Specification:
homodimer, Aldehyde Dehydrogenase, Chain A, domain 1, 6-stranded mixed beta sheet, 20 strands, binds nicotinamide-adenine-dinucleotide, binds sodium ion, Ald_DH_C (chains A, B), peroxisome (chains A, B)
């Protein structure tokens, strides 16, 4: 089995500890992953520092973008080869249905190809001139890699989230240390073998697996890390930023959400019913930007919600590998219990569990929850307030557009949001009013790698994907030159 | 004798306390400023919040850029009228030579004018298309104001630094709270009156003066502040970021530096002597990007450093308001003592003072220090590592280019840097190797409003000036719409 990927080969953790890896659908130990600690992390950062240091002959940061692009394209092609096997490992690892995992793999491939392309273009973008009011000065800018980057990623899209950061980071000329989640580490470790098979220069990508408070914390607080890029819980992101503050290092954060989907009356109920079920139940409801607060016009509310109930109850719940699986199990026991507790608390606070809310009868084992719709929701309820990370939808109703937007913005979060109405004039109005980083019109959840992705407010800051994803790993350098041959003439010259 | 500027009005601090104001050239109490406290900071942030939500933001934040442009231009014109008056106040307040303050005001006017232009251009940048590889989806970006912004500014360029922050913040559609330094708050308070005369919508700009640990801390930790932009010391920068981390608020930090100036042999000696002295002694040596580490080639070192002494001793030091003034006093007593202790510490470690390093004999009173150049410096010394923020130049010698860049990069800071040589191929090589946000070639210290300004490493992150300045106060929103009529087709419809 795999060890830590450091400096271009496999290294066993110094303390030789290992973490059990559970299959979410069976509850059986399916294997394990290495548990890295402080000094394992220290080796990773040194290797990354060495990968980009001047006196390295294969200086990754000083290489041309097209050279890095060749590595990225090769990484992509090797992943494309293993598509079917990597997707199967993905499903077993995190619990998402096979068709979802296979789609993620396609996106991984596209993501490396896209940033390979951007890497090629980057050389043309260097030395971009700045127009000045004086003729005595000339000015341009250089786009330089930020340096050594810590990449800390979630378990909901294990391989894709990692790729969302490593592809732009490498394309920019950075050396990376990746810390995937201890709940879903397998495919990211497979990326280490791919790097070996493609001859990625030593130390450019290092993969350190283990516990968040051991490996992750050590990585985040290491003084030689130049930038931390994070995706995960609000609390951990806060701790990570606190740690980064010690040595004043830049940070990008993508944290939870509690995204609204605003459904108006002038809508095809059935088409938008699939979207609202998708926005909340897809990835077993473990989406950062999940549209988990439904805000439906009162005039269609009860018939629209009834449709939702039928769609949701027709969703096939099974082992992720079984043909036709549209919902898998929650990633872990601890997560399962949190999701069930959220449903329990909603019931306790007086809300209605319209459908789901329990373990399905036909599956005795595994962390399975039926798609859950919750109504009679009040704005002070925990279910309205707190991100669930389970297939759980909370429903509220509205009578005016103004009320709809006030309900939509009734959260300290600000990641995603969706508007559903045929009136496109209304959609544009609502897309401006919704306090979010992403606004979907007449759909919910699609993330194209060409378009900037991120949140505002307690959902964090910074943008991934598109050209924004690359910039996240560049710094701007102003090169200003004095063209004239005249003395500056500010101070008095001495005498000679 | 002004008060706090809150919600478009002059208001006495709730607790009615005031802070004395010292003339740095006489050591006499010359006035006082209002001392805002937590209760006043709440009122200013509340007013800012109301300014963005008032009338769906149609008066400011959701208005077109041309509306804000008119205000910025109107402010510019007012400053320009009173530039000589504000220059005089600026010198008395911070202690810089009058011709420096006068030059600052020219830059203040041009800064408002420049961001007025960018405000007008901003409307045409809205809804910029994002190309997708699908027929079924369409995507564009909106550039929204980040919201309510905290602007914390230093005492070295009192009015200009405030302008660097507010001008792009207003152009963006933000509502700002300014917390100027308690050592130089006078011109910034005058800007309040300018907003009044110009009729700037209430709450768009608020000015809260006071102690850093009362007013500054209360502003930085306020839950309704959307973004903090800070320029000042490393320690405080670090504290701001830690506070922001609690509610995960984005920050931009410009901190100190220990910037290198590298002088090769193929150089006009008299011309670069001027530049080097300017690079280190200008603003009484209180520049963030001061080039305070000289790195000269051994072959020219002896006569180049001798010329440096000649220039340094010909710098006219006096009251900042006297006709020929070219160096004023250090801003305050505490700073004055720190600067003098830095020079003592150099002697402690065995370094040589070639000129200055003491009170000028003619001044007697005031916080004056002669322009100091020190030599026989070692890599391990405090004057090499730490920021003096006084007119104090440290000098090391080099022979090879590899030796030059390694000495230049021998710092945890990374704000500015300067190359001096007639060989432009060499200058370009060094500009790529120098780890800094600004690289100057054949000059030191000019900052054009068209070009991005900021640091890397422990000098901070984020960029001000140019279009980068505007972007600092904008957040990117992705708007994606499903244009197809076809059902999504992921789930199985429930019939019939
Ligand atoms: N919404 C999202 O974007 C998203 C994505 C993935 C996972 N998650 C969350 O992951 C959670 C799993 O637990 P967890 O990540 O909150 O803690 P954890 O179980 O990983 O570790 C427990 C303790 O370690 C601390 N810790 C973890 N990483 C740290 C680091 N890098 N530096 C300093 N301290 C660290 C945590 O604050 C906590 O006190 C789930 O509740 C799930 O909601 C959220
Ligand atoms: N290099 C630069 O960019 C630059 C520019 C201007 C001033 N300065 C520095 O200003 C210093 C003067 O003292 P000071 O600014 O370090 O402290 P201060 O005099 O403002 O206040 C003293 C204490 O309050 C704390 N504090 C100040 N503002 C705070 C805030 N907003 N939030 C939480 N704590 C805060 C400080 O950490 C310190 O412990 C000088 O040492 C000088 O070097 C540096
Ligand atoms: Na697992
Ligand atoms: Na003063």
């Amino acid at each position: 089995s795999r060890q830590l990927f450091i400096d271009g080969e496999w290294r066993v953790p110094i303390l030789n500890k290992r973490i059990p890896n559970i299959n979410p659908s069976t509850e059986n130990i399916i294997g394990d992953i290495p548990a890295a600690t402080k000094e394992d992390v220290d080796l990773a950062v040194d290797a990354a520092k060495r990968a980009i240091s001047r006196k390295n002959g294969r200086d990754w940061s000083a290489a041309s973008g097209s050279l890095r692009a060749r590595y990225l394209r090769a990484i992509a092609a090797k992943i494309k080869e293993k598509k079917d096997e990597l997707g199967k490992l993905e499903s077993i690892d995190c619990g998402k249905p096979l068709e979802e995992a296979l789609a993620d793999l396609d996106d991984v491939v596209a993501c490396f190809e896209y940033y390979a392309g951007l890497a090629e273009e980057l050389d043309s973008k260097q030395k971009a001139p700045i127009s000045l009011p004086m003729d005595t000065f000339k000015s341009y800018i250089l786009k330089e890699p930020i340096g050594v980057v810590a990449l800390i990623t979630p378990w909901n899209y294990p391989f894709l989230m990692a790729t969302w950061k490593i592809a732009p980071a490498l394309a920019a000329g950075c050396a990376a240390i990746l810390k995937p989640s201890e709940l879903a580490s397998v495919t990211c470790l497979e990326l280490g073998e791919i790097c070996k098979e493609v001859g990625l220069p030593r130390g450019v990508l290092n993969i350190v697996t283990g516990l968040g408070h051991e490996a992750g914390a050590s990585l985040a607080s290491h003084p030689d890390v130049d930038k931390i890029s994070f995706t995960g819980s609000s609390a951990t992101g806060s701790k990570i930023m606190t740690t980064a503050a010690q040595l004043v290092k830049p940070v990008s954060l993508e944290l939870g959400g509690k995204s609204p989907i605003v459904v108006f009356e002038d809508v095809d109920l059935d088409k938008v019913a699939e979207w609202t079920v998708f926005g909340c139940f897809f990835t077993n409801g473990q989406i950062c930007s999940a549209t988990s607060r439904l805000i439906v016009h009162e005039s269609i509310a009860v018939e629209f919600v009834d449709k939702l109930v039928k769609w949701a109850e027709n969703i096939k719940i099974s082992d992720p590998l079984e043909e036709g699986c549209r919902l898998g199990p929650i990633v872990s026991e601890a997560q399962y219990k949190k999701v069930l507790n959220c449903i329990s608390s909603a019931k306790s606070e007086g809300a209605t569990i319209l459908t789901g809310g329990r373990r399905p009868e036909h599956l005795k084992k595994g962390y399975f929850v039926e798609p859950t719709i919750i109504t009679d929701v009040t704005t002070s309820m925990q279910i309205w307030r707190e991100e669930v990370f389970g297939p759980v939808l909370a429903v509220k109703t509205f009578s005016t557009e103004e009320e709809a937007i006030n309900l939509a913005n009734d959260t300290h979060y600000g990641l995603g949001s969706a508007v559903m109405s045929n009136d496109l004039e209304r959609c544009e109005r609502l897309s401006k009013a919704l306090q979010a980083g992403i606004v979907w019109i007449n759909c919910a959840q699609p993330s194209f790698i060409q378009a900037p992705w991120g949140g505002i407010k307690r959902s964090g800051f910074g943008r991934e994907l598109g050209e924004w994803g690359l910039e996240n790993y560049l710094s701007v350098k102003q090169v200003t030159r004095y063209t004239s041959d005249e003395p500056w003439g500010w101070y008095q010259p001495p005498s000679k």
